[PDB]
Amino acid sequence: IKFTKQSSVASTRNTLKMAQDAERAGMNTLGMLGHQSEQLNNVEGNLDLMKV
Amino acid sequence: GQQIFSQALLNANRRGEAKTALAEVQARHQELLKLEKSMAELTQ
Numbered sequence: 001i002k003f004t005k006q007s008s009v010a011s012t013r014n015t016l017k018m019a020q021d022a023e024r025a026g027m028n029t030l031g032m033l034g035h036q037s038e039q040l041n042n043v044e045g046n047l048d049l050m051k052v
Numbered sequence: 053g054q055q056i057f058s059q060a061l062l063n064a065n066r067r068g069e070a071k072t073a074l075a076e077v078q079a080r081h082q083e084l085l086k087l088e089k090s091m092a093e094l095t096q
Contacts, residue, residue: 004077
């Protein structure tokens with residue numbers, strides 16, 4: 001009985017760990033997509049200027 | 053002038069709850085393993 005409860009505790013520990021790792025990756029990706037969005041804004045401005 | 057003993061009997065109490073403390077751990081355990089597998093894929 002006890003062994004299964006221990007295994008489940010270990011399961012939920014690894015589960016939380018993986019969830020946190022996933023979240024770190026997601027936050028870096030969103031910030032990084034925002035940075036690339038700003039760069040693309042600069043590109044867009046330059047293209048508009050070149051059209052003129 | 054005499055003297056007495058006593059005995060024990062285990063009562064459905066355990067016939068159920070103690071057997072459930074195997075089935076209901078390993079099975080919820082099965083739900084938790086499923087959760088862990090899904091989180092592993094999500095993290096990847």
